[PDB]
Structure formats: C-alpha cells, structure tokens
Amino acid sequence: AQLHSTVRAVPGNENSLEIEELARFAVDEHNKKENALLEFVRVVKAKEQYEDEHWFPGTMYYLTLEAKDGGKKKLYEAKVWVKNTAAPPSHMNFKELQEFKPV
C-alpha cells in the first residue's frame, strides 16, 4: 500500500519475460472486464515502483504496450500491481490490473 516515491525506468530487455507476461495479463484482464478484442503485440516501455516493506515487497508496473484493435495497432498504458508472498503458483500471490487506458 505504501510505495517508495521513486519510479524506476526499466532499461531495454530487463525483466522482459516478467514484463511481457504482465502485459498479456493486463490485456486479457481488460478484454475480460470490458469484453474487448485487443490482441497483444509487444511492450514498448516499462516502469517499476517498489513497495516500502522489507519482505515480499510488492511492485507496481507502469507498462506501455502495443495492441491490435481490429487490426489497428494502438498504444495503451497498463498499471499492474504484483505482490508475491510465496513462490508461484500459489493463491497467496496477488496480481491486479488497476488501470488500463489508451494514449
């Protein structure tokens, strides 16, 4: 809940797999919630904001991803919260698409 005030920009191809999966999740969560048809393409850029506490610190991902909407490639901004208190797959881990907006 309480995050560090700094927001780190993720250099090119750092955490690419974790980030590319969180992007797909974000799209899938958007399509499920708004019954949309967006098709993921790639992550453009990513930022990370880290939780304050010592153990199992959550991360807040600010993702800029490209998705196809009826063939039209468009940019979107995804905000995803991830707090893993145990090694996945476990139901104690939380993953939530908090915001999904176009650009």
Binding site: E21, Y50, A86, A87, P88
Partner: protein, 172 residues
C-alpha cells in the same frame, strides 16, 4: 591532495560474472588533443589495449582480478574487482558494500544459454522476493536491515538450483 583519478566502470555493472559472459570495462578519464589513448592495468600489469573501453567477449577465470586505468588528463584509478565464477546459477550485484539509502540492484544470472524460471531471492535463508520468470531484484533505498548473506534460486532448465551466497554490508 584531491587528484583527478580516472574511474573504471563495468558494462554491465556486475562485478560477479559467469564464465563465457561478455564484460566491457570503460575508463572515465579525459583525453588530450594529441593523446586519446587509455592505459589499462590488470593485476598491476600494463596490458596492450589502449582503447577507451577494454572488451572481453567471453570471460575466463584468467580475466578475474583487479583493473585500473588512466588517461592523459587523469590519474591512475582505484582498482575494480572482477570475479569470474563457474556454475549453473549466479547472484550478481554491482558491488558488495552499499551506503545507506542507496539502491541495491541484484540479478540472478544462469549459465550461458540456459533458461531460468521461478526465481527466488533469499536473504539470510529467508525468501525475500518471488518471481515467475527471471526478473532482477531492485531495492531502491538500502537500509541497515538489508545487510546479510544473499542468494537466488530457480529452475535452470528443469533443474532446481540454488546459487552461492554473497555477503552484502550497508555502511551507516
């Protein structure tokens, strides 16, 4: 008194690398209009390279040790330690002494051309950060409680592997 000492920088920043990794060492020192050469030292010995950055395509154990550099307008740098390890898995860091409030950037690196999944970072034998794939562990603000022995753990291919431990101290 205060001299303009050159500064060796690693690219990537990891001072612990696995064999076969690429490592670039850059000299942060100003050139003169006539002398744009760089003096590179390895274990107090002057090596042949005189370029801005000393490139290591595939690191070997012989590449470990201390490195220093110097340019025309700077002074012989302090030494930077490079450790080359051989293992399936490795916990990487830019250094092992961090000032309080500085960021601690850790990376779990698997042997050349191996997949790493379900990475866990542990401090003093306790799980601290769990990932599904292989993400770096970034701690933006180091504190006194961040000191300890660290290692990372994951699946290298299909083998569950734990890396060697690394001590990290925080100075107040």
């Amino acid at each position: 008194e205060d001299l303009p000492k050159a500064v060796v920088f690693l690219e990537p920043q990891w001072y612990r690398v696995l064999e076969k990794d690429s490592v670039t060492l850059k000299c942060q020192g100003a050139y003169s209009p006539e002398d744009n050469s760089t003096q590179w030292f390895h274990n107090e010995s002057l090596i042949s390279s005189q370029a801005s950055s000393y490139f290591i395509d595939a690191a070997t154990v012989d590449d470990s040790g201390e490195y220093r550099c110097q340019t025309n307008l700077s002074t012989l740098s302090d030494p930077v330690q490079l450790e080359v390890h051989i293992g399936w898995l490795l916990l990487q860091a830019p250094r092992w002494v961090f000032k309080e409030e500085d960021p601690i950037h850790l990376r779990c690196h698997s042997w050349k051309n191996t997949a790493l999944h379900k990475v866990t970072y542990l401090q003093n034998g306790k799980g601290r950060k769990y990932f599904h794939h292989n993400s770096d562990f970034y701690i933006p603000k180091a504190t006194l409680k961040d000191s300890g022995s660290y290692f990372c753990r994951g699946l290298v291919g299909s083998k569950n592997v734990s890396s060697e431990t690394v001590n990290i101290t925080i100075t107040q």
